[PDB]
């Protein structure tokens, strides 16, 4: 499968990896299990005005939107930087609500790149928002039979708002070059105007409640987590792990590294997490790749034979079953994990070749001055079999 050919010639080949496929999944979300208030956030009697929009901490929580399903249907549930399907497999270190009420035709203005009175004078979502926006029609709630004239919106402003920057002024806006000194008039403008959400208006003029859930995931301890159920911990097998939304595939081991009191995972030189703090036991688990790079296959040729040898590069012959995790391999692989002809070289551990103390010329260069050859043992040891041998190369 590495060479992509049903016929393999005599030699030594660096097979990439096909031994191990993880069969177990590990989830280690912390001890929160407390239903987060989505009736104290989504089911509030009154939200803020878009100019004076509210913002709140969410604190320790399980964020399961499934509880809201028979409460209201979210017409707008666009999510940025995070897919909705993954929202149940994640933990968030910080979450903010950013709730307000707008007109329907203006919900499309709650987006990173948008222009309009809401997106220029009122809210101005940033360009790297990485949270996501929930919006739903609230004409049943935020509408009085005479029209609800709360939810002020800033109509004029001398400059565009900055991302996430609020602005309460109550000043007087100058259209022309005639000072108002703080009094109203004809060229003088009050910068805020009331929506006027009557119940029987067009759907574009009916109120919509928007919750701009801006959440960030850092190396801090997780604060809000999804509904995912925490499983047990497997500490010697190649598994799929998901600790606080940080998924991966590897072997978890006891580690003696020291983390900061608020550090959840370590990092390698590359952008790979090599250690993670299990948030239930608070232990530190080292993460090792499932794939073991260094396995070379020594073949005399498929037309010649099917017996092969395996060189495991830079490993101890005792550690080979643990290095390649021979428990999860098929028995045909487990034949080459342990045995009698487990000759140890400087290049690595050679299993499947009968090491001989004779010095023949090189046939298949193995490494560290050792060569393999497919020799006729039938004429050697009474009635024996054609077999692979390894030896020190002859100079």
């Amino acid at each position: 499968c590495t060479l992509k050919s049903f016929t393999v010639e005599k030699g030594i080949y660096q097979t990439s990896n096909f031994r191990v496929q993880p069969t177990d999944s590990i989830v280690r979300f912390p001890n929160i299990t407390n239903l987060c208030p989505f009736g104290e956030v989504f089911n509030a009697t009154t939200f803020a005005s878009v100019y004076a929009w509210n913002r709140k901490r969410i604190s320790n929580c399980v964020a399961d939107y499934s509880v809201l399903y028979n409460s209201t249907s979210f017409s707008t549930f666009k999510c940025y930087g995070v897919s909705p399907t993954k929202l149940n497999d994640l933990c968030f270190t910080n979450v903010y609500a950013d709730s307000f009420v707008v007109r329907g035709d203006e919900v499309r203005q709650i987006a990173p790149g948008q222009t309009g009175k809401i997106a220029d004078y009122n809210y101005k979502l940033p360009d790297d928002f990485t949270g996501c926006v929930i919006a739903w029609n609230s004409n049943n709630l935020d509408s009085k039979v005479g029209g609800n004239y709360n939810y002020l919106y800033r109509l004029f402003r001398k400059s565009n708002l900055k991302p996430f920057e609020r602005d309460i002024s109550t000043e007087i806006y100058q259209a022309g070059s005639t000072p108002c000194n703080g009094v109203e008039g004809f060229n003088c403008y009050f910068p805020l105007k009331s929506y006027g959400f009557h119940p029987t208006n067009g759907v574009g003029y009916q109120p919509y409640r928007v919750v701009v859930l801006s959440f960030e995931l850092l190396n801090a301890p997780a604060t809000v987590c999804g509904p995912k159920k925490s499983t047990n911990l497997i500490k010697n097998k190649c598994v799929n792990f998901n600790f606080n939304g940080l998924t991966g595939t590897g072997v978890l081991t006891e580690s003696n590294k020291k983390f900061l009191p608020f550090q959840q995972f370590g990092r390698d030189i590359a952008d790979t997490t090599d250690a993670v703090r299990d948030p239930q036991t608070l232990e530190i688990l080292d993460i090792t790749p499932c794939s073991f790079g260094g396995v070379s296959v020594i073949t005399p040729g498929t037309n010649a034979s099917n017996q092969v040898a395996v060189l495991y590069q830079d490993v101890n012959c005792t550690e080979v079953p643990v290095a390649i995790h021979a428990d999860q391999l098929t028995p045909t692989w487990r034949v080459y994990s342990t045995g009698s002809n487990v000759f140890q070289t400087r290049a690595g551990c050679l299993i499947g070749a009968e090491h001989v103390n004779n010095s023949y010329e090189c046939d298949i260069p193995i490494g560290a001055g050792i060569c393999a050859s497919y020799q006729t043992q039938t004429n050697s040891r009474s009635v024996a079999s054609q077999s692979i041998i390894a030896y020190t190369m002859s100079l």
């Binding site: 990439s16 994640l90 940080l246 952008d271 790979t272 790079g293 490993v315 550690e319 100079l395």
Partner: protein
């Protein structure tokens, strides 16, 4: 450089009256660190869905691994072409009476466990090999506390360093066989079997091969031996202290290590994706939305691997050129005496001694390098009996009123005789001529 205006001489010559057997040292890379790159382990790591994306993306890495395997096989072939040389493994000539020449620090000693000479010891000490020369086990990388090393990162990211087929000790055994054949046969073992010859007289023949007759050696033999020993000791001390053995070899080793470290550190490049952490992409986006970012990462890391392999092929072209040069110098100065000028030393080549060095070979070129010049007056085709006479292996230089036919590169004046000068042509047709002799 210094201005050294030499006075052109219409009739005068400068013949050097005293040489300087100098052991120049050159260092030639012979091989580079051969590496293997895992497709999915680098590009994707342990991910089934990233593996599927890399499968449907294309089959670049079969070609990449074919190129890298070609590079590794060529590295082994270069090492065969230079170090392997003569397969007959000649052992050290226990009879060490080499006419004064010592070879004590160039021929290996059985005292230490490794049959590696002391000059080779200094060479192997000077080159750090801080990346792959040392032995690192998987148990070392599995258990660690402080921080994961660079080599552990490379191993866990699909980057492996394949050990050279020829062990350093058997490389030293090749070099010891070459040294034994050179100090017992000299050059005859480069054509057929080794033909034994006492070192002093093959040394005399090596002078014969630079226009300096053997009349020099047996007359100056103790001085020749002591000069060679002093030169070898001086280069030994300079090698011990000047760190000049780094040269090309340390540059090659650092180049390979830096290329591997660049490949590892370039996994943190986003390449336009949301992040370089593949698991953060895979743990925040649905497979459709995640495919765009993972394809950007696949393209970026495939380009990184392609660049790595491209300058690996270019560097292996340079290494193959240097290894062909090393084989040429091995089979023209260790297996013979090159007549090319400045090919195996500044002066007139005498021989060369191969020394194993990390991923390379050190040549101790022994050269003639004459000195102690002396002005004489020279006139060719002396007119005797009305006929021009020309010097057969002579120059026709003059002392005060005394004309001596003299060897080219060594002032050994001799009287004019017909067995040393050949007559041809009427005299007076030749432009600068004068007899008053023979």
């Amino acid at each position: 450089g210094a201005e050294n205006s030499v006075a052109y001489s219409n009739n005068s010559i400068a013949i050097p009256t005293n040489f300087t057997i100098s052991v120049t040292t050159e260092i030639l890379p012979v091989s580079m660190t051969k590496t293997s790159v895992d497709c999915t382990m680098y590009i994707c790591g342990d991910s089934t869905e990233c593996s599927n994306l890399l499968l449907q993306y294309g089959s670049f890495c079969t070609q990449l691994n074919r190129a890298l395997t070609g590079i590794a096989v060529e590295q082994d072939k270069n090492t065969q072409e230079v170090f392997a040389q003569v397969k007959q493994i000649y052992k050290t000539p226990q009879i060490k009476d080499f006419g004064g020449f010592n070879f004590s620090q160039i021929l290996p000693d059985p005292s230490k466990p490794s049959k590696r000479s002391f000059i080779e010891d200094l060479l192997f000490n000077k080159v750090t090999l801080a990346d792959a020369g040392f032995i690192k086990q998987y148990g070392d990388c599995l258990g660690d506390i402080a921080a994961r090393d660079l080599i552990c990162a490379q191993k866990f990211n699909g980057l492996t360093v394949l050990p050279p087929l020829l062990t350093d000790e058997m490389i030293a055994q090749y070099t010891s066989a070459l040294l034994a054949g050179t100090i017992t046969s000299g050059w005859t073992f480069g054509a057929g079997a080794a033909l034994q010859i006492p070192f002093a007289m093959q040394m005399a023949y090596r002078f014969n091969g630079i226009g300096v007759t053997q009349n020099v050696l047996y007359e100056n033999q103790k001085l020749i031996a002591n000069q060679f020993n002093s030169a070898i000791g001086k280069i030994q001390d300079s090698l011990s202290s000047t760190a000049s053995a780094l040269g090309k070899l340390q540059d090659v080793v650092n180049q390979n290590a830096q290329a591997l470290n660049t490949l590892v550190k370039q996994l943190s490049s986003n390449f336009g994706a949301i992040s370089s952490v593949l698991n953060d992409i895979l743990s925040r986006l649905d497979p459709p939305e995640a495919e765009v970012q993972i394809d950007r990462l696949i393209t970026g890391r495939l380009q990184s691997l392609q660049t790595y392999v491209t300058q690996q092929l270019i560097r292996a072209a340079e290494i193959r050129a240097s290894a062909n040069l090393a084989a040429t110098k091995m089979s023209e100065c260790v297996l013979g005496q090159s007549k090319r000028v400045d090919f195996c030393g500044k002066g007139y080549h005498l021989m060369s001694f191969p020394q194993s060095a990390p991923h390379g070979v050190v040549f101790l070129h022994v050269t003639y390098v004459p000195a102690q010049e002396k002005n004489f007056t020279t006139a060719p085709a002396i007119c005797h009996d009305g006929k021009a006479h020309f010097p057969r292996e002579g120059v026709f230089v003059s002392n005060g009123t005394h004309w001596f036919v003299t060897q080219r590169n060594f002032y050994e004046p001799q009287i004019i005789t017909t067995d040393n000068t050949f007559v041809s042509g009427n005299c007076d047709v030749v432009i600068g001529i004068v007899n008053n002799t023979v």
